[PDB]
């Protein structure tokens, strides 16, 4: 089972040797990848390359890849056990990555000649970023031993499922801050299951909901105890998984069409949710599209490419 | 009121006088396009050029140019009223011309080197007869005194009305063929009213409707009886106008999905009804956007523009 340019290994060795392979793999694995984001900051425009948040991002990107080169040949479980170690910590240290960047390339972007610079800066950034954390996740993952896994690789996915719990979540921060949430309804093939990795729906799916639901709730500042339901529809075919979300918060205006898939745009939380969530799809051989109804509603079309 | 490169005349003067207007603008807009036309003809491939149902058309613009030119110039409400007669005459005898296009290109285009070529062509030469064939027809139905009506640009359209009417119309072809047809349900801005001009959607939506009910039928051939609506969602907006037609007819496969668009290409009447209506729309300042959630159905959204 494969992604873009990396593989997510299924082993189950009884010695435990299919550990020792992963974390080798890692090793001649993560440093290029490390170095390759470490270029683009690099040759980021100057003034946007001195801004001291990106600096710090920055920064933190030498440090990974100085440790993970650092750190000797894996020979043994005992060396095995300590590199995890080091990916833990680098993962923890690195979680607020896309919080920073976003903070530090907000100002300093408004300098710059060319404009699909910072575009491409994170698309490259972000994605490569995702498979750095799917690969490293991976290999702690698959010191689990739960039920239906083999490292992050889920061998019986429901969509319906991982939908509904996001459903949950979305519709709690909603409410919150509205005093509702619209429902969720979802159809189509509701029973659908099948290996797929859950991490970038994970990231997706909340980005996505909470768009449908604050679009519901701030054209219905009349009624907030009724408001329109929010209908997902599932898709499972050979090819691909298509998740519809179709919401009647009254459209995404025509003047602000050509923005909303900009970094930074925002009519509101910092404008990251749907760039992010299309290159993430794209990163894996899918796709993200919208579809305005202005003065009705949107339908936001996810599709994910089937695992190999 | 306007459209692409030619103005609809909504003159009402008691004298008549509009009427003389009207006639000497086609007079001095008409033989220009066909001219136009004249010339994609005489610049298509040799082979396909060559022929015979080629040939004929291309002799059909050649004697509706002709005739045209050997009009006298138009002075007086009884030169007017002849000129009707030509314009009448020309409208019928090229009723047929989509068809016959058709059928000249089916096997001819088979044979050329480039493939964007006949696309090309076909666009070029639809949507300008489209044109051709509303300002003839406009200029007609200045005559009439039709409520709501000036020309052919109706002043309150009501697109739920306009829909309903094609609905009835593709229900009774499918259920002659299938022994039953999809419900439609209509929602959204059921109630909209706006000047608009009806022609273009009397082609795009019977098209768009078949296609959906065929589908619809040819995934539920257990239950003929019992299939699931064709769901048509009205947005009107200060912008445009969106007419989405959703059908849970199973989707547009992976295979077929970039042929779709292209002319002559069918599952199956002769494969015209996707690219014309795309055609069309974008001629007419809109779009034709196709979803396909494989396994499931397909949502096609037509936009068109409001008028200015
Ligand atoms: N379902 C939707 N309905 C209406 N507008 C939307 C929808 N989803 C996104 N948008 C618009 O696109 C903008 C960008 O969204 P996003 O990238 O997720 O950033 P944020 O939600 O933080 O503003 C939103 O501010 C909102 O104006
Ligand atoms: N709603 C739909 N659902 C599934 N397939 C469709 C739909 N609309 C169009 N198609 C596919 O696209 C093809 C082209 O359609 P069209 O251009 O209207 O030509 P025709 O209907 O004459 O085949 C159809 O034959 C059909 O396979
Ligand atoms: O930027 C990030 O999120 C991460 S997590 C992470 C984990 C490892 Cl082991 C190495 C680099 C690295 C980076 Cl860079
Ligand atoms: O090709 C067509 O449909 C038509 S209708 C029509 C009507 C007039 Cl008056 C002139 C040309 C012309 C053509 Cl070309
Ligand atoms: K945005
Ligand atoms: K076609
Ligand atoms: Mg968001
Ligand atoms: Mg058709």
Same mark, same amino acid.
């Given at each position: ?12 060795? $009884?010695?435990?040797?299919?550990? /020792? ?6 090793? $001649? ?21 001195? !801004? ?29 056990? $300590? &590199?995890? $170690? /080091?990916? =833990? ?10 919080? /920073? ?27 490569? =970023? ?54 969720? =309804?979802? !159809? ?14 994970? &990231? ?105």
């Amino acid at each position: 089972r494969l992604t873009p340019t990396m593989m997510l290994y299924s082993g189950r060795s $009884q010695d435990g040797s299919h550990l /020792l392979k992963s974390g080798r793999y890692l090793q $001649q694995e993560l440093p290029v990848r490390i170095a390759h984001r470490i270029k683009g900051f690099r040759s980021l425009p100057f003034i946007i390359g001195c !801004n001291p948040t990106i600096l710090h991002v920055h920064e933190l990107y030498i440090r990974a890849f100085q440790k993970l080169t650092d750190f000797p040949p894996i020979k043994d479980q005992a060396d095995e056990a $300590q &590199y995890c $170690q /080091l990916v =833990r910590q680098l993962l923890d240290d690195h979680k607020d990555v896309v919080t /920073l960047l976003a903070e530090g390339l907000r100002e300093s972007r408004k300098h710059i000649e060319d404009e699909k610079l910072v575009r491409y800066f994170l698309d490259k950034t972000l994605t490569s =970023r995702l498979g750095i954390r799917m690969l490293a996740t991976h290999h702690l993952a698959l010191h689990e031993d739960k039920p239906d896994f083999v490292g992050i690789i889920c061998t019986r996915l429901s969509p319906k499922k991982i939908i509904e719990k996001w459903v949950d979540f979305a519709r709690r921060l909603c409410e919150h801050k509205y005093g509702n949430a619209p429902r969720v =309804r979802i !159809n189509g093939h509701v029973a659908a299951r099948f290996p797929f990795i859950p991490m970038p729906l994970d &990231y997706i799916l909340p980005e996505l909901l909470k768009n449908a639901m604050r679009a519901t709730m701030e054209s219905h500042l009349d009624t907030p105890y009724n408001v329109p339901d929010v209908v997902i529809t599932i898709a499972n075919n050979d090819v691909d998984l298509i998740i519809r979300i179709s919401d009647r918060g009254g459209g995404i205006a025509h003047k602000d069409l050509d923005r909303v898939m900009d970094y930074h745009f925002t009519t509101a939380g910092f404008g990251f949710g749907l760039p992010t969530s299309r290159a993430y799809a794209e990163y894996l051989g899918g796709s993200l599209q919208l579809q305005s109804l202005q003065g009705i509603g949107t339908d936001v079309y996810l599709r994910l490419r089937h695992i190999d």
